[PDB]
Design a protein around this ligand. Structure first.
Ligand SMILES: Cc1c(-c2ccccc2)ccc2nc(N)nc(N)c12
Length: 446
């Protein structure tokens, strides 16, 4: 096993990784900004290194500082968590070039999945169903681009190859708006990604967001760990995630899961990963792959018994996956509610000092958060301060436990979305299940 690792992240995910390390007897190095000295995981870590000031550019995105911290502490690996540098192929490359293990796939694989055009080509080649599209980047010939749009059939959507997670796309409903839509998407892509490449897909009207979790080791094993429905979202920010996805049968799960695992083998995938799909009229369409462990990983852990972070670390050390595909069983149901420090009317981050804190407990209740009484949520980082995960023998029990747990949760001194989460749990359409990606924003609009 890895002797010692740098946790190149903060907040709840840093604590999550620290726990997994502690379980495996791995020494921890907590790199942190000057604003994060009193983070729970920092206080629990074996060694700590202040890598810079509050702003992320000089701390959590500071590649030299992070690598230097690994060097000086004699760490052997770096876990990037999610966000920050976790999908930064150049960082992964530098980590490996510097002689440390990057907890993720090969840098070339990160780069492939970061190039949405090339990722789709690879997935399509491997037998994964994709959205009907341009199958290549759009040029500047608008006669050709109109022909592609006609072949696909309107509405279509223009997307930046360097984008993803809702970033760098726009819907086109007729020829009249096509040229300008392509030009603007391209200009925004150039400005944001220093990559002006764009592509076209059919715009699905009312899909659900359903993603598949995979794990692949360096011994050739690749497994899928069911799916997650992430359709309950606002402006591409997930709000509630659940596993399994309501209405997905064992046969569909098998069908799409096997295709994702096969794709992993074809591309030489290593580590945890997520295949994102749109799901509509009983059909899956691949849009994007993530290579990091994600925020919503805990729902998959609850329904499979697999500790995904521990698997990442075992894989990185050269150990095979601790479980075979035949040993992966979906059992029960899990729901995750993201807890955000945000204003209820604006939805802007609402930082501040927590004056009173109480976490929920009980059977099937899992609380993932670094916060504590007297902890100050800084203004410099994301608004998500914790994750409440509830498991039950079925979806109704999971939801009932969530309702109870949300009622026990006390976070005074700052504004949170606990009340909104309670409203969602009480929503009759959510209780029925299978609401589409548009549902929450429509509910909030009314
Ligand atoms: C709906 C949608 C999303 C999308 C995913 C998660 C949250 C919000 C939107 C992402 C990519 C998408 N791509 C196509 N071609 N069509 C969609 N309808 C779509």
């Amino acid at each position: 096993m890895l002797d010692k690792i740098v946790i190149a992240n903060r907040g709840e995910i840093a604590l999550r990784i620290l726990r997994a390390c502690k379980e495996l007897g791995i020494k921890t190095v907590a790199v942190h900004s000057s604003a994060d000295r009193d983070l729970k995981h920092v206080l629990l870590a074996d060694e700590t290194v202040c890598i810079g000031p509050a702003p992320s550019v000089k701390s959590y995105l500071n590649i030299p500082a992070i690598i230097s911290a690994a060097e000086i502490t004699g760490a052997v690996a770096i876990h990037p968590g999610y966000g920050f540098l976790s999908e930064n192929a150049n960082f992964a490359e530098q980590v490996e070039r510097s002689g440390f293990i990057f907890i993720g796939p090969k840098a070339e694989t990160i780069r492939l999945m970061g190039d949405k055009v090339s990722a789709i080509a690879a997935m399509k080649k491997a037998g994964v169903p994709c959205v009907p599209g341009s199958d290549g980047p759009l040029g500047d010939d608008m006669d050709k681009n109109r022909a592609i749009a006609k072949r696909i059939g309107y509405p279509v959507i223009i997307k930046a190859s360097g984008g993803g997670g809702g970033r760098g796309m726009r819907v086109v409903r007729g020829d009249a708006e096509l040229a300008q839509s392509i030009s603007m998407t391209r200009a925004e892509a150039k400005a944001a990604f220093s990559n002006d490449m764009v592509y076209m897909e059919k715009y699905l009207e009312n899909p659900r967001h359903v993603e598949i979790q995979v794990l692949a080791d360096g011994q050739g094993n690749a497994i899928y760990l069911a799916e997650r429905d992430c359709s309950m979202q606002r402006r591409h920010q997930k709000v509630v995630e659940e596993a399994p996805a309501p209405g997905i049968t064992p046969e569909l799960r098998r069908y799409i899961g096997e295709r994702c695992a096969k794709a992993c083998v074809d591309i030489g995938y290593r580590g945890a990963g997520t295949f994102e799909f749109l799901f509509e009229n009983g059909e899956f369409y691949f849009i994007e792959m993530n290579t990091r462990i994600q925020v919503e990983h805990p729902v998959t852990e609850m329904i499979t018994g697999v500790d995904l972070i521990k698997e990442q670390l075992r894989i990185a050390a050269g150990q095979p996956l601790s479980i075979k595909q035949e040993e992966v069983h979906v059992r029960g149901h899990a729901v995750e509610c993201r807890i955000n420090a945000e204003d209820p009317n604006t939805f802007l981050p609402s930082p501040g000092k927590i004056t009173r804190f109480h976490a929920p407990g009980g059977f099937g209740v899992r609380w993932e958060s670094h916060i504590y009484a007297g902890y100050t949520v800084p203004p410099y980082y994301d608004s998500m301060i914790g994750k409440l995960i509830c498991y039950g023998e079925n979806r109704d029990v999971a939801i009932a436990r969530m309702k109870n747990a949300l009622q026990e949760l006390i976070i005074d001194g700052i504004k949170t979305n606990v009340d909104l989460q309670i409203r969602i749990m009480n929503d009759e359409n959510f209780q029925h299940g299978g609401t589409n990606i548009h549902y929450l924003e429509k509910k909030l609009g009314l």
